Amino acid sequence: DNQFYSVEVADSTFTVLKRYQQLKPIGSGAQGIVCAAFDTVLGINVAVKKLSRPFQNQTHAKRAYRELVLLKCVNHKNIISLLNVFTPQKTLEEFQDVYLVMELMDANLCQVIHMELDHERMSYLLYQMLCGIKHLHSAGIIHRDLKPSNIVVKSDCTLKILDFGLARTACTNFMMTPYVVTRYYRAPEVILGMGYAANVDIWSVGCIMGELVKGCVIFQGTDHIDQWNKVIEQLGTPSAEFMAALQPTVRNYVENRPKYPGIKFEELFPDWIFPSESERDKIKTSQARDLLSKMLVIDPDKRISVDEALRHPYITVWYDPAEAEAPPPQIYDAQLEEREHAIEEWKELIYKEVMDW
């Protein structure tokens, strides 16, 4: 051996390749622990996620296996890409821990929202988000949890989408980065229990987009019921056509709420909150608002697609087919994940996935 060394991190032990130095805990939960580290070989800072014996039970096992498999299906600069996957254990019989390495970014979108962004920066961030989303969707992956804390950035305005769910509990949780609840970013079709398609993510991008402008959460409801009130208060009561797709109980609840005409987007998102130094900013403001009005549509059938959004005048200035059309290596298949496995089998599946990386 002599490849691995151990360090005390949290209430645990990180046994990692000697190339990873200066480990500092930055995130913790029941499903995983993330440290910042310096990669001496790459000469860069990295983030190392430890999954501690992910096979310990059925819930942990399926989540560890799903993570490894999902990350196997993606290959895009605007999505988390693994620099390394390893285990310090040498055989299956003794296999215990899995370590995932990614590039350390500078900040998450939470820390970007209350900065003075211009149209060029805003449209570029949005462009990258859309590129990332398009890649995921073509890989058969709906994120479902697109929110500012799941989006990471560097000082050059480059951006990546990830999923920093660690199944956090009272004892386990610790964060060196801001967190925000998913609720504010859930599409109405999710809220109302409708069953959904990939464009739930487009709704989330519109919420994120609006927040980048206003500096405040767009639909800040106290709970899932209240989210709906905040949606209709601004966008207005949805169509009978939309309500017809609801289950009878949810349908009647929705029909019982006060009727709202909806606020004009020129009024919800006024010129003054946008950059306006030049005549060209005025043009860009109109484009941004138009794109916003097409993402924040209650009915997913009437909501803009990622394809259309990438072609929108606000976004298309950045369009490069090498980025916005890059295909994923394969489409995610949930078959082996949704198979039932004894713990020993999950152990071997996860093991093989690591050794194969």
* Cα(48)–Cα(83) distance, integer angstroms: 10
Asked if 113 interacts with ligand B96 (CB under 6 A), we say no
How many residues bind to ligand B96 according to rule CB under 6 A?
Answer: 26
- Known binding residue 335? Answer is no
Asked if 137 interacts with ligand B96 (CB under 6 A), we say no
- Known binding residue 30? Answer is yes
Is the CB of 119 or the CB of 143 nearer to ligand B96?
Answer: 143
Is the CB of 82 or the CB of 194 nearer to ligand B96?
Answer: 82
The DSSP bridge partners found for residue 7 are 14
Helices (H), 116-169: 119-138
Asked if 86 interacts with ligand B96 (CB under 6 A), we say no
How would you classify the pairing of strands 44-51 and 98-103? Answer: antiparallel
Closest alpha carbon to 132 in 166, 155, 109, 115? 109
Asked if 337 interacts with ligand B96 (CB under 6 A), we say no
**Smallest separation (angstroms) from ligand B96 to the CB of 164:** 4
Asked if 143 interacts with ligand B96 (CB under 6 A), we say yes
The DSSP bridge partners found for residue 4 are 17
Closest alpha carbon to 216 in 289, 113, 133, 139? 113
The single residue among 4, 13, 53, 66 that binds ligand B96, judged by CB under 6 A, is: 66
The owner of tokens 């599409």 is 187
CA 294 from centroid of its chain's CA atoms: 20
**Smallest separation (angstroms) from ligand B96 to the CB of 245:** 26
* Cα(280)–Cα(13) distance, integer angstroms: 55
The single residue among 29, 50, 67, 201 that binds ligand B96, judged by CB under 6 A, is: 67
Active-site hit among 1, 11, 118, 145: 145
Asked if 63 interacts with ligand B96 (CB under 6 A), we say yes
Task: Please measure the distance between the N-terminal and C-terminal CA atoms of the chain and give it in whole angstroms.
Answer: 20
Asked if 80 interacts with ligand B96 (CB under 6 A), we say yes
Window 177 to 236, contacts with ligand B96 (CB under 6 A): 177
**Smallest separation (angstroms) from ligand B96 to the CB of 163:** 3
271 counts as catalytic: no
- Known binding residue 10? Answer is no
**Smallest separation (angstroms) from ligand B96 to the CB of 210:** 22
Asked if 130 interacts with ligand B96 (CB under 6 A), we say no
**Smallest separation (angstroms) from ligand B96 to the CB of 332:** 9
Asked if 47 interacts with ligand B96 (CB under 6 A), we say yes
Say how many C-beta atoms besides its own lie within 10 A of residue 319's C-beta.
Answer: 15
The owner of tokens 């060394």 is 5
Is the CB of 167 or the CB of 283 nearer to ligand B96?
Answer: 167
Closest alpha carbon to 323 in 149, 134, 84, 197? 134
Stretch that binds ligand B96, among 96-104, 188-196, 216-224, 281-289 (CB under 6 A): 96-104
Sign of CA dihedral 347, 349, 352, 357: negative
The owner of tokens 């370590």 is 99
Helices (H), the chain: 58-72, 119-138, 188-191, 200-214, 224-235, 240-243, 248-256, 265-268, 279-295, 306-311, 313-316, 321-324, 343-355
Stretch that binds ligand B96, among 64-72, 120-128, 186-194, 306-314 (CB under 6 A): 64-72
The single residue among 14, 55, 124, 164 that binds ligand B96, judged by CB under 6 A, is: 164
How would you classify the pairing of strands 20-28 and 44-51? Answer: unpaired
Q: What is the DSSP letter of 116?
A: -
Asked if 152 interacts with ligand B96 (CB under 6 A), we say yes
Q: What angle do CA 13, 18, 23 make, to 5 degrees?
A: 50
Mark the binding-site residues for ATP, compressed into ranges. Answer: 26-34, 49
Catalytic residue numbers, as ranges? 145
Q: Where do contacts with ligand B96 occur on this chain (CB under 6 A)?
A: 26-27, 34, 47, 49, 63, 66-67, 70-71, 74, 79-80, 100, 102, 104-105, 141, 143, 152, 161-165, 177
